[PDB]
Design a protein around this ligand. Structure first.
Ligand code: HEC
Ligand code: HEC
Ligand SMILES: [Zn+2]
Lengths: 136, 136
């Protein structure tokens, strides 16, 4: 019933990025430069296939610094993790939701079984609760 | 003596990202959100080894739109490509430098055999002409 730390996620397929700046409704706590990653099973889902159990999506959130008309990556703030298990995570739509502070396996963040995460992701029911779209 | 189009680069290792905003000295043509990718060979060099022949670094440059304090990736502007061949690219320090407009193999951007690219990358001679640092 716990989401595994997605060991090796930095070697996975980079789906997309986005910057959330001060003023954005999600600045707290989603502020920063984020990178979405997908394991092979998650790519099958993202391509328009179905998500197999064992699909993992990671959102990797960095602080950034302003550096002369450049936003430069600073320290990692956290990672968000969605792990597909249709039966074990059925209460949250077949994805298990976890956060790791600074991306550290020992800093698990979620305290409500992921109901808060799922509450926002539920808007994306028709893309199987995933916001990110595969781009070329 | 032409750099090959790096087919499949989107499936490679994501090294790092950066945003270059308007007013940056390199705004033309490096303005946008960029993602650096490395093939397996290039990872050896980034980890502290010698870059082997066949190492390829790609910088993938997107337009973005500031939409309510989110920077949102738009169309791809171009890719920059560095291809390691100590002998074939000896005039430019063993890297071949090329750009592909909109990331399309038929839109080559470099017109000076990469001397302009090399002129700036030469400052990084001590890190084998590569600016990007591997981060976890
Ligand atoms: C709305 C108020 C959200 C809440 C609460 C949570 N997330 Fe979410 N997440 C949200 C958006 C708008 C996006 C897309 C970002 C983009 O660049 O397009 C995401 C994305 C993720 C991802 C990546 C997969 C995807 O659905 O695109 C993961 C792995 C993820 N978020 C995890 C996650 C967790 C663990 C949360 C609770 C701790 C959480 N999110 C809440 C919107 C919102
Ligand atoms: C200085 C005036 C530059 C010129 C001219 C060119 N490049 Fe360069 N490039 C520059 C910097 C500061 C960076 C690092 C960006 C980052 O996020 O840290 C880069 C990076 C690249 C890369 C990625 C590999 C690396 O060295 O980090 C590639 C593949 C690359 N640049 C290609 C490229 C080409 C093809 C150029 C001539 C058309 C070229 N660059 C010019 C600085 C400068
Ligand atoms: Zn200025």
């Amino acid at each position: 019933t716990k989401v595994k730390y997605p060991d090796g996620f930095r070697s996975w397929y980079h789906v997309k990025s986005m910057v959330i700046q001060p003023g954005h409704p999600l600045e707290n706590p989603f502020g920063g430069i984020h990178h979405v990653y997908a394991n092979a099973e998650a790519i099958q889902g993202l391509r328009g296939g179905n998500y197999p159990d064992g699909a993992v999506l990671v959102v990797d959130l960095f602080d950034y610094q302003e550096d002369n008309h450049a936003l430069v990556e600073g320290k990692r703030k956290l990672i968000g993790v969605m792990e597909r298990d249709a039966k074990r995570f059925s209460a949250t739509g077949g994805w298990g939701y976890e956060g790791f502070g600074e991306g550290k396996p020992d800093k698990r963040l979620v305290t409500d079984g992921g109901q808060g995460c799922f509450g926002c992701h539920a808007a994306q029911k028709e893309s199987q609760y995933v916001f990110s779209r595969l781009r070329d």
